[PDB]
């Protein structure tokens, strides 16, 4: 009779069924957390490693959210009230509590809720004399691109020349989600990498440390297979 209208929640959160999220208790998603080297990390529990990696990646990115409700739940997350933002991730990605989710799939959905912060330029080059190399610049906070330093082949033109795809520039701040099969480095340089340790971790590339839940391990990027890279001011 006297509730916030449903369209008020949709404006607040930016998706049409937000009232159905807003009515739900979020307290089952209040995972234990600690602040480890200045960032909020979730203790490993209930297959939540994918949530920890998503939220640590976002803290390396430093996003500005487009919608007030996201901004509010994010500010609460960083100050230690984590449940609402964590539930929001399970809700948006569509993962049962207790099941594993895919970090890159989740980050990909979050792009529309975040103010654009960077751009990535990918060249698809060929030596063919009939076909032309192409260049495409994607602008956002999260974008799909090969995270392999020297690029990768991408099939052939009909004249039998290889196409090669490669990141040739990054401006601003952006997370690149790896596009193809998982491979060893060298990787495009960034501040942090989402990686596989049999589960998700996040590697800080300036401190050379790996977050595993709330634990921290000094190790090297060479020991890891990265699925995404967080790049800051180029
Ligand atoms: Zn050709």
- Do 132 and 87 belong together in one domain? no
Kind of pairing, strands 174-177 and 225-231?
antiparallel
- CA distance linking residue 60 with residue 57, whole number of Å: 5
CA angle, 113 then 85 then 4, to 5°: 80
* Ligand 1 centroid to residue 160 C-alpha, Å: 7
- Do 64 and 134 belong together in one domain? no
- Do 129 and 220 belong together in one domain? yes
Residue 181 belongs to some domain of the structure: yes
- The four Cα atoms 55, 56, 62, 64 give a dihedral, to 10 degrees, of 0
- CA distance linking residue 165 with residue 213, whole number of Å: 34
* Ligand 1 centroid to residue 161 C-alpha, Å: 6
Contact indicator for 173, 61 with CB cutoff of 8 Å: yes
Q: At 85, list the tokens.
A: 């933002």
CA 106 to chain centroid: 7
Kind of pairing, strands 225-231 and 215-218?
unpaired
CA 221 to chain centroid: 18
Does 151 sit behind a cis peptide bond, omega within 30 degrees of 0 on the bond before it?
no
Q: Which of these three, 97, 113, 129, is where a domain ends? A: 113
- Do 171 and 84 belong together in one domain? no
* Ligand 1 centroid to residue 12 C-alpha, Å: 49
Residue 72: C-alpha distances to residues 124, 131, 155 (Å): 40, 49, 45
- Do 47 and 108 belong together in one domain? yes
Q: At 156, list the tokens.
A: 């052939």
* Ligand 1 centroid to residue 147 C-alpha, Å: 26
* Ligand 1 centroid to residue 124 C-alpha, Å: 12
The string of DSSP letters for 160-184 reads SPEEEEEEEEEEESEEEEP-SS---
Residue 157 burial (CB count, 10 A): 14
Q: Which of these three, 113, 143, 171, is where a domain ends? A: 113
Residue 56 burial (CB count, 10 A): 25
Q: Which residue has the tokens 């990918």?
A: 122
- Do 151 and 131 belong together in one domain? yes
Kind of pairing, strands 134-140 and 142-144?
unpaired
Q: At 142, list the tokens.
A: 């999260």
- Do 125 and 188 belong together in one domain? yes
- CA distance linking residue 10 with residue 147, whole number of Å: 35
CATH number at residue 35: 1.10.8.1190
Q: Which of these three, 113, 140, 161, is where a domain ends? A: 113
CB proximity list for 75: less than 8 A, separation 6 or greater: none
Beta bridge partners of 173: none
- Do 173 and 226 belong together in one domain? yes
* Ligand 1 centroid to residue 186 C-alpha, Å: 29
Residue 9 belongs to some domain of the structure: no
- CA distance linking residue 143 with residue 122, whole number of Å: 11
- Do 88 and 177 belong together in one domain? no
* Ligand 1 centroid to residue 102 C-alpha, Å: 36
Q: At 194, list the tokens.
A: 């989402």
- Do 217 and 143 belong together in one domain? yes
Domain containing residue 63: 26-113
Contact indicator for 203, 195 with CB cutoff of 8 Å: yes
Nearest Cα neighbor of 47 from 91, 105, 90, 109 is 90
Long-range CB contacts (within 8 A, 24+) of 223-226 = 224/193, 224/195, 224/196, 224/197, 225/182, 225/183, 225/184, 225/195, 225/196, 226/147, 226/178, 226/185, 226/187, 226/193, 226/194, 226/195
CB proximity list for 93: less than 8 A, separation 6 or greater: 101, 102, 105, 106, 109
Contact indicator for 152, 146 with CB cutoff of 8 Å: yes
The string of DSSP letters for the chain reads --SPPHHHHHHHHSSTTHHHHHTS--GGG---EEEETTEEEEPP-TTTHHHHHHHHHHHHH---BSSHHHHHHHHHHHTT--HHHHHHHHHHHT--TTS---HHHHHHHHGGGB---EEEEEEEE---SSS--EEEEEEESEEE---BTT-EEEEE-TTSPEEEEEEEEEEESEEEEP-SS-----B---SEEEEE---EEEEETTTTEEEETTEEEE--GGG-EEEEEEE---
Residue 15 belongs to some domain of the structure: no
Residue 140 belongs to some domain of the structure: yes
CATH number at residue 187: 2.60.120.1680
- The number of folded domains in the chain is 2
* Ligand 1 centroid to residue 178 C-alpha, Å: 26
Q: Which residue has the tokens 């080297």?
A: 37
* Ligand 1 centroid to residue 128 C-alpha, Å: 5
- CA distance linking residue 195 with residue 205, whole number of Å: 12
> In Å, what resolution does this model reach?
1.7
Side by side, the strands of the sheet bearing 152-156 are 134-140, 118-125, 162-172, 152-156
- CA distance linking residue 17 with residue 3, whole number of Å: 15
């Amino acid at each position: 009779v006297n509730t916030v209208p449903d369209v008020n929640w949709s404006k607040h959160f930016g998706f049409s069924d937000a009232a159905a999220f807003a009515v739900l208790d979020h307290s089952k998603f209040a995972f234990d957390s600690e602040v480890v080297d200045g960032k909020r990390a979730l203790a490993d529990s209930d297959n939540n490693c994918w949530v920890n990696a998503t939220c640590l990646a976002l803290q390396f990115l430093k996003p500005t959210f487009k919608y007030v409700g996201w901004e509010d739940l994010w500010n609460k997350f960083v100050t230690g009230d984590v449940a609402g933002f964590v539930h929001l991730l399970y809700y948006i990605e569509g993962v049962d509590k207790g099941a594993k989710g895919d970090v890159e799939s989740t980050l990909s959905k979050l792009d529309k809720y975040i103010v654009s912060s960077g751009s990535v330029t990918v060249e698809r080059s060929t030596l063919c004399d009939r076909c032309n190399s192409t260049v495409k610049t994607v602008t956002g906070a999260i974008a799909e691109a090969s995270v392999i330093l020297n690029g990768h082949t991408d099939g052939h033109c009909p004249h039998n020349f290889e196409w090669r795809v490669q990141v040739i520039g990054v401006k601003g701040d952006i997370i690149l989600l790896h596009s193809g099969s998982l491979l060893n480095g060298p990787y495009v340089y960034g501040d942090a990498y989402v990686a596989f340790s049999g589960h998700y971790t996040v590697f800080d590339n300036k401190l050379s440390k790996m977050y595993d839940g709330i634990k921290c391990v000094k190790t090297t990027l060479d020991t890891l297979v990265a699925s995404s890279v967080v790049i800051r001011n180029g």
